[PDB]
Design an enzyme around this catalytic site. Structure first.
Site, PDB file in Angstrom:
ATOM      1  N   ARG A 149      44.953  40.606  48.346  1.00  0.00           N
ATOM      2  CA  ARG A 149      44.559  40.308  46.974  1.00  0.00           C
ATOM      3  C   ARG A 149      44.346  41.636  46.263  1.00  0.00           C
ATOM      4  NH1 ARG A 149      38.612  38.417  44.872  1.00  0.00           N
ATOM      5  NH2 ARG A 149      39.277  37.643  42.818  1.00  0.00           N
ATOM      6  N   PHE A 195      41.174  46.689  38.668  1.00  0.00           N
ATOM      7  CA  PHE A 195      39.988  46.037  39.235  1.00  0.00           C
ATOM      8  C   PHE A 195      39.763  46.541  40.659  1.00  0.00           C
ATOM      9  CE2 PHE A 195      38.111  41.679  40.610  1.00  0.00           C
ATOM     10  CZ  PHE A 195      36.877  42.251  40.785  1.00  0.00           C
ATOM     11  N   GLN A 252      41.742  44.263  47.806  1.00  0.00           N
ATOM     12  CA  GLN A 252      40.949  43.530  48.789  1.00  0.00           C
ATOM     13  C   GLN A 252      41.749  43.270  50.052  1.00  0.00           C
ATOM     14  OE1 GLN A 252      38.755  40.228  47.214  1.00  0.00           O
ATOM     15  NE2 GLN A 252      38.563  39.178  49.180  1.00  0.00           N
ATOM     16  N   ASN A 305      32.683  38.528  49.469  1.00  0.00           N
ATOM     17  CA  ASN A 305      31.866  37.434  49.976  1.00  0.00           C
ATOM     18  C   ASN A 305      32.183  36.151  49.231  1.00  0.00           C
ATOM     19  OD1 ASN A 305      30.067  37.024  47.668  1.00  0.00           O
ATOM     20  ND2 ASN A 305      29.110  38.959  48.239  1.00  0.00           N
ATOM     21  N   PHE A 324      36.641  45.309  49.741  1.00  0.00           N
ATOM     22  CA  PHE A 324      37.478  45.759  48.646  1.00  0.00           C
ATOM     23  C   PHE A 324      37.161  47.196  48.286  1.00  0.00           C
ATOM     24  CE2 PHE A 324      34.483  45.189  45.060  1.00  0.00           C
ATOM     25  CZ  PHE A 324      33.558  44.331  45.628  1.00  0.00           C
ATOM     26  N   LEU A 383      29.346  43.438  39.546  1.00  0.00           N
ATOM     27  CA  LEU A 383      29.218  43.087  40.951  1.00  0.00           C
ATOM     28  C   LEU A 383      27.939  43.647  41.559  1.00  0.00           C
ATOM     29  CD1 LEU A 383      32.949  43.520  42.044  1.00  0.00           C
ATOM     30  CD2 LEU A 383      31.774  41.450  41.258  1.00  0.00           C
ATOM     31  N   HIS A 427      27.495  42.056  45.524  1.00  0.00           N
ATOM     32  CA  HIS A 427      28.284  42.546  46.642  1.00  0.00           C
ATOM     33  C   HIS A 427      27.637  43.801  47.183  1.00  0.00           C
ATOM     34  CE1 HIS A 427      31.694  39.806  45.992  1.00  0.00           C
ATOM     35  NE2 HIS A 427      31.166  39.777  44.785  1.00  0.00           N
TER      36      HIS A 427
HETATM   37  C1  LIG Z   1      38.131  33.868  45.883  1.00  0.00           C
HETATM   38  C2  LIG Z   1      38.968  34.700  46.854  1.00  0.00           C
HETATM   39  C3  LIG Z   1      38.493  35.152  48.062  1.00  0.00           C
HETATM   40  C4  LIG Z   1      37.095  34.799  48.530  1.00  0.00           C
HETATM   41  O1  LIG Z   1      36.143  34.961  47.815  1.00  0.00           O
HETATM   42  N1  LIG Z   1      36.975  34.280  49.858  1.00  0.00           N
HETATM   43  C5  LIG Z   1      35.681  33.889  50.365  1.00  0.00           C
HETATM   44  C6  LIG Z   1      35.180  34.786  51.484  1.00  0.00           C
HETATM   45  C7  LIG Z   1      34.959  36.279  51.271  1.00  0.00           C
HETATM   46  C8  LIG Z   1      34.495  37.015  52.259  1.00  0.00           C
HETATM   47  C9  LIG Z   1      34.169  36.377  53.606  1.00  0.00           C
HETATM   48  N2  LIG Z   1      33.658  37.190  54.694  1.00  0.00           N
HETATM   49  C10 LIG Z   1      34.350  35.087  53.785  1.00  0.00           C
HETATM   50  C11 LIG Z   1      34.887  34.233  52.642  1.00  0.00           C
HETATM   51  C12 LIG Z   1      39.352  35.934  48.954  1.00  0.00           C
HETATM   52  N3  LIG Z   1      40.678  36.289  48.625  1.00  0.00           N
HETATM   53  C13 LIG Z   1      41.095  35.838  47.444  1.00  0.00           C
HETATM   54  C14 LIG Z   1      42.250  35.880  46.632  1.00  0.00           C
HETATM   55  C15 LIG Z   1      42.205  35.239  45.391  1.00  0.00           C
HETATM   56  O2  LIG Z   1      43.198  35.136  44.432  1.00  0.00           O
HETATM   57  N4  LIG Z   1      41.001  34.735  45.321  1.00  0.00           N
HETATM   58  N5  LIG Z   1      40.221  35.033  46.502  1.00  0.00           N
END
Ligand SMILES: Cc1c(C(=O)NCc2ccc(N)cc2)cnc2cc(=O)[nH]n12
Length: 164
Positions: free
Chosen positions: A54, A59, A62, A101, A112, A121, A125
């Site tokens: 991502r 920005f 990730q 998260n 990220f 953030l 975060h």
């Molecule tokens: C909303 C989102 C997330 C996300 O927030 N995932 C939830 C999560 C984060 C960290 C941990 N450890 C566990 C779960 C992760 N990648 C993408 C790509 C995108 O277009 N939206 N998106």
């Protein structure tokens, strides 16, 4: 001293170079230790071979979902998730390293690297390090993102580890 770790990154199978990160273990020791161990792979799993899935220009970039490769997965060295350690370090500008998260106290392995100041953030975060070297690599990664976060090249952490 604080750990230095590295990520070697490819785009469509061609090396872009190395990103070197300082982990602020003096401020967030548990969060730093998780990332350090995921770079070395010493627990038997970690970032090697996983992707920047991502990437949003102006920005952040990730990565770190080494189980599902799409933003739904990852795990920490402690268990599936771990608490927010503190919010002391802020998203002050390009090069900040912070935990992704899904709400409070859901840190795993996803992280990220900011390419701008992301002040909204702060308090949400956990910031745990910053880029020491390789911002040019980060800017290349960023250039392969899109508004939706979908990448236009396959961005792979081919190697990673600890330098000190
Ligand atoms: C909303 C989102 C997330 C996300 O927030 N995932 C939830 C999560 C984060 C960290 C941990 N450890 C566990 C779960 C992760 N990648 C993408 C790509 C995108 O277009 N939206 N998106």
């Amino acid at each position: 001293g604080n750990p230095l770790v590295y990520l070697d990154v490819d785009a469509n199978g061609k090396p872009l170079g190395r990103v070197v990160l300082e982990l602020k273990a003096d401020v967030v020791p548990k969060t730093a230790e998780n990332f350090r161990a995921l770079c070395t792979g010493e627990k038997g799993f970690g970032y090697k071979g996983s992707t920047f899935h991502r990437v949003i220009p102006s920005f952040m970039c990730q990565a770190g979902d080494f189980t599902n490769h799409n933003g739904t997965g990852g795990k920490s060295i402690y268990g599936s998730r771990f608490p927010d350690e503190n919010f002391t370090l802020k998203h002050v500008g390009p090069g900040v390293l912070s935990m992704a998260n899904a709400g409070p106290n859901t840190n795993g392995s996803q992280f990220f690297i900011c390419t701008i100041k992301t002040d909204w953030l702060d308090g949400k975060h956990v910031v745990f390090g910053h880029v020491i070297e390789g911002m040019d690599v980060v800017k290349k990664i960023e250039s392969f993102g899109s508004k939706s976060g979908r990448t236009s090249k396959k961005i792979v952490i081919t190697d990673c580890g600890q330098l000190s």
